Design a protein around this ligand. Structure first.
Ligand code: HEM
Length: 118
C-alpha cells in the first residue's frame, strides 16, 4: 500500500491511511478535514490550492499520470523526500484525488553517505 491520502476538489483530506499516520505524524482524526498543504513546506504549501485549481480549469496534468519526487513535511517539522503518484476519481459528482506516497528518505540517506565517502 504505502501512504495513501484522498482529497476532495478543494485539497481537503477525506481519508488518511494508517501508513500515512506513521509517515506524517498526524493521526487519522487530526488529518481529515485539514487541507493537504499541511503535509508540505513553503512555497508549495500556499501555492498548492492554486496548482489544484489550475489543473481543474486547464485539465493539463503536471504530476497526474507522471509521478514526481518532492519534499513532504511531518508534524514535528522535519522535511523529507518522497515519490508521489496522484490519481483522479469522481464520487457524488465531485472530483477526488488520491495520492500514493513512497518515503525516499532511506534512499537519499544511502546516496549522500556513499557520496561523502568519495
Ligand atoms: C505532500 C507533499 C506534496 C507536495 C510537495 C505537492 C506538490 C505539488 C506540486 C509542485 C504540484 C504541481 C506543480 C507543477 O508541476 O505545476 C502539485 C499538484 C497537485 N497536487 Fe500535490 N503535492 C503534495 C501532495 C499531494 C497529495 C497528497 C495530493 C492528493 C491526495 C495532491 C494533489 C495534487 C493535485 C490534484 C495537483 C494538481 C495535479 C496536477 O498538476 O497533475 N498533492 N502538487
Amino acid at each position: 500500500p504505502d501512504a495513501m491520502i484522498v482529497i476532495d476538489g478543494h485539497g481537503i483530506i477525506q481519508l488518511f491511511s494508517t501508513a500515512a499516520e506513521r509517515l506524517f505524524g498526524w493521526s487519522e482524526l487530526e488529518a481529515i478535514g485539514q487541507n493537504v498543504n499541511i503535509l508540505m513546506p513553503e512555497p508549495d504549501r500556499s501555492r498548492h490550492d492554486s496548482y489544484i485549481s489550475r489543473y481543474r480549469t486547464t485539465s493539463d496534468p503536471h504530476i497526474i499520470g507522471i509521478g514526481r519526487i518532492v519534499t513532504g513535511k511531518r508534524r514535528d517539522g522535519t522535511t523529507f523526500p518522497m515519490h508521489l503518484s496522484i490519481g483522479e476519481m469522481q464520487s457524488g459528482g465531485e472530483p477526488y484525488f488520491t495520492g500514493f506516497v513512497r518515503d525516499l528518505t532511506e534512499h537519499q540517506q544511502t546516496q549522500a553517505r556513499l557520496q561523502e565517502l568519495q
